[PDB]
RNA sequence: GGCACUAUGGGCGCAGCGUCAAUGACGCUGCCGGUACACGCCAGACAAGAAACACUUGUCUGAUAUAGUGCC
């Protein structure tokens, strides 16, 4: 039917100078071709690799392409800063093309415990009839990161939303919001508003609350 | 360099509307190229559209757009276009046109790729935004620093912008990626790290401007105390 | 994949009509059956043509060719 496509690792954290390989795994015989391509942020993809192997006119002779069978890799042989960015596989062996899901390759850097703040919501905003919680994880690293939402220690699901700024450019460092939200009436059948964050950098779950109506 | 794709007609329109994609191409003859499309919906990876091979017309489609979208090409015009009809707000992506190699030169790999044109499937109206203090608190601030922002929510469509002191402060400030909410309207909010020693001896005021709406609105985030 | 047996008027029976289909199905009816070979012709596969498919051209294969069942 359709040839799937499935890329490795889905993020990778690297510095520079690294040996990076990813690698891409196809489901049926795509024979050579596989062409790899980076994507940067707001910007078009750019050609690497084409016939799985094959170095794109202009590209650096760093990156090689690689088959094996169905797997496929490519591999940056020394990381440049230039270099961080999506990278994608896609086989074109038959139609539907088929784009594996995407490998970002992210700066390490050591681990920064997130700072963490939490916001009740404005007395404007009830006049709405809506209430939102803001949860701020501020600067840590690395990215991964659970925000646990509890109302009276009852972790709540299906009502927050996050969203995590890209990795700063001075301290590469991330930042994450997370808003949970309520109705006005389910936000005064409660009192204890809390975020309960899981980070790397935590020695143990970090946890933010307040009591609805402190002045 | 003289190769180029120029890619227009993106927009918004509600869902089951329609829009025609154009990708008019220079520095060489459309004829003897395959043109695809490839889309990329907001923080998701390249998705495959539909396709043109030379010599023959022959046209190419994902499941996902089958019998709705109708990949095409005019040589006198030196344009391949998109006619996208019946759009569902799963289709919502920033649109890209790209170019086949030449099969000897780069096999079948797309060498030049347009520069993208967005395209927003929504049945939303235009809506500018409610500005709400993130106000910061009493307890803890024993950081030497105290965050405090600004709640930028139920708007349509992006962009808002948000500055600080009306742009004088920007050090430590974030702005987080708008997410999409069940409403179909947009949040996203606007936070500042400060000096915990000026909060009440400082002012802070986040500017939002939603241009769609006409809408700016200045917010003064102000500590509560006890 | 290998092994085993099993089946195949042009590999191209000669035709007709209904053909539906969307490319998935064809079929009945008639007609006549030296044999290979040479071709043609068609169909595969391969390359090349600005060329995934179609198209054009070249080369090759259709007897050790396609078609099943069992074994492994």
């Not at chain 1, 899981?198 to 933010?208: A, C, D, E, N, R």
């Not at chain 2, 920007?170 to 708008?178: C, D, I, K, L």
Request: proline share 5%; with cysteine; hydrophobic share 30%.
């Amino acid at each position: 039917s359709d040839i799937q496509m499935t890329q490795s690792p889905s993020s990778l954290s690297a510095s520079v100078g690294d040996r990076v390989t990813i690698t891409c795994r196809a489901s049926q015989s795509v024979s050579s071709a596989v062409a790899w391509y980076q994507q940067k942020p707001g910007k078009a993809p750019k050609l690497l690799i084409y016939s799985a192997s094959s170095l794109y006119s202009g590209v650096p002779s760093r990156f090689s392409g690689s088959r094996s069978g169905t797997d496929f890799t490519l591999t940056i042989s020394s990381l440049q800063p230039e270099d961080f960015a999506t990278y994608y596989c896609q086989q074109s062996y038959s139609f539907p093309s088929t784009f594996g899901q995407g490998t970002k390759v992210e700066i390490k850097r050591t681990v920064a415990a997130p700072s963490v703040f939490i916001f009740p919501p404005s007395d404007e905003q009830l006049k709405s009839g809506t209430a939102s919680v803001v949860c701020l994880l501020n600067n840590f690293y690395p990215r991964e990161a659970k925000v646990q939402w509890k109302v009276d220690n009852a972790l709540q699901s299906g009502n927050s939303q996050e969203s995590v700024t890209e990795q700063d450019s001075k301290d590469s460092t991330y930042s994450l919001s997370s808003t949970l939200t309520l109705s006005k009436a389910d936000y005064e059948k409660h009192k204890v508003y809390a975020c309960e964050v899981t980070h790397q950098g935590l020695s143990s779950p970090v946890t933010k609350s307040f009591n609805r109506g402190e002045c | 360099s003289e190769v180029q794709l120029v890619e227009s007609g993106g927009g918004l329109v509600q869902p089951g509307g329609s829009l025609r994609l154009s990708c008019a191409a220079s520095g060489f003859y459309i004829s003897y190229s395959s043109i695809h499309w490839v889309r990329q919906a907001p923080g998701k990876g390249l998705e495959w559209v539909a396709s043109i091979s030379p010599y023959s017309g022959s046209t190419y489609y994902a499941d996902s757009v089958k019998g709705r979208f109708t990949i095409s090409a005019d040589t006198s015009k030196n344009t391949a276009y998109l006619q996208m009809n019946s759009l569902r707000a799963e289709d919502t992506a920033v649109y890209y046109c790209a170019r086949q190699g030449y099969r000897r030169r780069s096999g079948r790999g797309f060498d030049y790729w347009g520069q993208g044109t967005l395209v927003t499937v929504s049945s939303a109206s235009t809506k500018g935004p409610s500005v709400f203090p993130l106000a910061p608190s009493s307890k803890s601030t024993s950081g030497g620093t105290a965050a405090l922002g600004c709640l930028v929510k139920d708007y349509f469509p992006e962009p808002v912008t948000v500055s600080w002191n009306s742009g004088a402060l920007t050090s430590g400030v974030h702005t987080f990626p708008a997410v999409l909410q069940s409403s179909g309207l947009y949040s996203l909010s606007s936070v500042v790290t400060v000096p915990s020693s000026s909060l009440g001896t400082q002012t802070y005021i986040c500017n939002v401007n939603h241009k769609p709406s006409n809408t700016k609105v200045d917010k003064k985030v102000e500590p509560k105390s006890c």
